[PDB]
Design an enzyme around this catalytic site. Structure first.
Site, PDB file in Angstrom:
ATOM      1  N   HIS B  10      76.076  42.012  -3.929  1.00  0.00           N
ATOM      2  CA  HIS B  10      74.507  41.559  -3.730  1.00  0.00           C
ATOM      3  C   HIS B  10      74.553  40.285  -3.208  1.00  0.00           C
ATOM      4  CE1 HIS B  10      74.199  38.799  -7.053  1.00  0.00           C
ATOM      5  NE2 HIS B  10      74.926  39.205  -7.684  1.00  0.00           N
ATOM      6  N   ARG B  61      69.339  42.668  -9.505  1.00  0.00           N
ATOM      7  CA  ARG B  61      69.645  42.086  -8.217  1.00  0.00           C
ATOM      8  C   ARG B  61      70.937  43.165  -7.587  1.00  0.00           C
ATOM      9  NH1 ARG B  61      71.765  38.584 -12.219  1.00  0.00           N
ATOM     10  NH2 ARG B  61      73.881  37.695 -12.037  1.00  0.00           N
ATOM     11  N   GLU B  88      77.849  41.130 -13.841  1.00  0.00           N
ATOM     12  CA  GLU B  88      78.696  40.181 -13.516  1.00  0.00           C
ATOM     13  C   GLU B  88      79.106  39.473 -14.967  1.00  0.00           C
ATOM     14  OE1 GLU B  88      80.099  37.609 -11.551  1.00  0.00           O
ATOM     15  OE2 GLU B  88      78.358  37.493 -10.472  1.00  0.00           O
ATOM     16  N   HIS B 185      78.806  43.225  -8.348  1.00  0.00           N
ATOM     17  CA  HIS B 185      78.918  41.715  -8.240  1.00  0.00           C
ATOM     18  C   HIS B 185      80.206  41.046  -8.138  1.00  0.00           C
ATOM     19  CE1 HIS B 185      74.983  41.841 -10.906  1.00  0.00           C
ATOM     20  NE2 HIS B 185      75.476  43.044 -11.153  1.00  0.00           N
TER      21      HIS B 185
END
Ligand SMILES: [Cl-]
Lengths: 251, 240
Positions: B10, B61, B88, B185
């Site tokens: 992202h 996200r 993440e 991520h």
């Protein structure tokens, strides 16, 4: 004992063309996208929470679901898609506009098709301009030759939606999961008819409002009272008057 | 017929614009990060790619990046699976601090250590931390054992909890012949790259994956890459 919520998608690009959509994968217009945003905000203001979500394989219903989950801050929920919640298949009428079908197929057939629970429209044959776009789309490649429809009456649509209810959605409800269903008018009619025990005549006269969340309070999965609507009292009253008048004008 | 696998990291987030550590905090994309995802989707569309199943994290996200790509390629109907194991890295007590406040509170030496280390975690997130209830009492993690919910993670920790999902769910899908897309991520994707290529600790700490660009792998029957990772898009983007 349990709480269930349904939502019907709003206006599409082909509604603006006054054209039969059915299984054609038309997207939302700006007004239909707005209706999904308003229903999502009504759920947000009332504090609703879900644990799993079901929708069709058509983008006008999927984008409605996406907008709701954005509005309520629950984009992390698991999502399940199925052809069994698609809109009714309009056969050879797909892609025609509505003042043309009376010239093509006759006023008597238009009356019969509007009146009847169990009479299908004509089939979508291989020379139909949307045959390859729909019947040969790879998203339906895992269906048997018997499951892939060329056309559908209302009875047909309800008969292919209810096995998914029975086999996949009911066991989630009994497990205590709070379920949200984002789909289309005729596939949601199937669920409503089964829940409330309505007649064929009554279910043909029931048109659900668009973009307004529909709430059921259910141990034996029997409704404690009939469907209730979430939103501002005045905006709800006007939408139901509008839908009733549109229904009455078509007879 | 080498298997084909596609990854995408992202783009810029709202908290990147403030230079604040995000970690497991659920920050949305910025307008620029959304635009990045639209350009990556258009690259996949122009190349004619088709997928059969998608995997992503429980953070918005990454989920919004995947949604934007599926919109661009007209594949909104595909099945989607979300898992916390693709999240993440958890930055512990650093969550919510910008770099200035971090250096002022913890000193320059510990900052050098934490940035340069493969297996030294940052300070834990404790019950008086501003974001402790926001993250550790979020109901999306209610089915994890008390053993599994982190108060902080090293890079080694992140990789160790991401690879079990690769081995137990993604590899059988690839062996069945399904075409897979993964939207996630930086640090969780680093785990997959390190396993695929057999990279050393120092090498993986030096690897920085580009954002918003499709990353393509060609794998043999043992799922080993046959050549280095490649990228999709215009000449300038690809070269940079
Ligand atoms: Cl989704």
């Amino acid at each position: 004992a349990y709480k269930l919520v349904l939502i019907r998608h709003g206006e599409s690009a082909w509604n603006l063309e006054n054209r039969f959509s059915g299984w054609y994968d038309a997207d939302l217009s700006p007004a239909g996208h707005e209706e999904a945003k308003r229903g999502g905000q009504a759920l947000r203001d009332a504090g609703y929470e879900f644990d799993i979500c079901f929708t069709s394989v058509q983008k006008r219903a999927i984008r409605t679901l996406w907008t709701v989950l954005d509005a309520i801050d629950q984009m992390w929920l698991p999502v399940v898609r199925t052809w069994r919640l698609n809109e009714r298949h309009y056969g050879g009428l797909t892609g025609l506009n509505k003042a043309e079908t009376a010239a093509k197929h006759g006023e008597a057939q238009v009356k019969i098709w509007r009146r009847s629970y169990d009479v299908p429209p004509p089939p979508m044959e291989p020379d139909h301009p949307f045959y390859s776009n729909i019947s040969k789309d790879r998203r339906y490649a895992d269906l048997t030759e018997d499951q892939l429809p060329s056309c559908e009456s209302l009875k047909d649509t309800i008969a292919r939606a209810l096995p998914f209810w029975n086999e996949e959605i009911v066991p989630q409800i009994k497990e205590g999961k709070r379920v949200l269903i984002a789909a289309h008018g005729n596939s949601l009619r199937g669920i409503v008819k089964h829940l409330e025990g309505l007649s064929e005549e009554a279910i043909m006269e029931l048109n659900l409002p668009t973009g307004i969340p529909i709430v059921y309070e259910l141990k034996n999965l029997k409704p404690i009272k009939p469907m209730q609507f979430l939103g501002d009292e005045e905006t709800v009253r006007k939408a139901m008057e509008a839908v009733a008048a549109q229904g009455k004008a078509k007879k």
